[PDB]
Amino acid sequence: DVPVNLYRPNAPFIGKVISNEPLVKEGGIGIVQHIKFDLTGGNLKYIEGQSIGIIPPGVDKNGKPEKLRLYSIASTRHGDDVDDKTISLCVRQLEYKHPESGETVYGVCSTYLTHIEPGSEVKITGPVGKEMLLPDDPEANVIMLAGGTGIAPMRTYLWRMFKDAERAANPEYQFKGFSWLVFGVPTTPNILYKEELEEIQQKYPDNFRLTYAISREQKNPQGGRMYIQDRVAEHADQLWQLIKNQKTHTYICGLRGMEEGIDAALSAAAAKEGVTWSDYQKDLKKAGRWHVETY
């Protein structure tokens, strides 16, 4: 009942791009695109929290074909239109530095994807992944800690939980727990899906809390730029108290190295009560309540 590997690299599914919209607004840093693909004509099914592969055209520096890159699925199982025939991605263009062989380098698969046109064919493998799945328990608490494109699986949980079209589509799942997104981005215009997050938070004030950490607009108490771990420390006592509930799941997604400041904060909260966080967290992993995907 979790689909995995319905399509593999040796024989991928050829989808078509339907749309490709920018998510970063003017004044923001970088390019992050929301890309939607047509799934009709194949049998790709998937659920929230999974990833798929894209195989980009071309050869590397050695004249070897390009490998697949993985992307968290950014839509619910139904697609953004709730019709069960599309899938979406949230793709940032990776680019870096002049001291990297002289001048600025562009990522292969993410440049390809963030400049791809509607009507183009794309090779898609997957779905893969069973570590970031959402429990079918309507009464769960769900803590989400996202940075940048790590909003993507979170968007599939929240959309499942709170979009009226989704609730109409999923009678078994009517969500009534509490969920809290701490979202880290560099500027207000880099808040991916801002308008839709904030609409959810005003239809459902008792069920959803939305905390930002915006590093170029906010300072932490030491005087640094505000980072998601700064906010997690700000609330580490509340977050630890929520985690003690047998129903609470915690999801962590974003770039590598973001985990260690989340543990430092929760260790100091757990310790007040003679709990050793890293022992507690091992048991949470074992029990399926601790979900991490950084990259």
Ligand SMILES: Cc1cc2nc3c(=O)[nH]c(=O)nc-3n(C[C@H](O)[C@H](O)[C@H](O)COP(=O)(O)OP(=O)(O)OC[C@H]3O[C@@H](n4cnc5c(N)ncnc54)[C@H](O)[C@@H]3O)c2cc1C
């Ligand atoms: C499970 C998983 C989920 C992912 N989900 C998403 C998602 O939702 N959205 C998204 O945009 N991406 C996601 N990615 C990351 C994505 O797969 C690709 O790694 C990323 O898009 C870059 O691929 P590329 O082809 O653009 O870059 P490549 O062309 O392969 O460039 C990457 C390589 O260049 C180097 N490099 C990268 N950054 C730097 C730097 N700052 N300084 C120096 N060298 C550097 C490294 O050698 C790296 O291997 C995910 C990855 C994984 C593993």
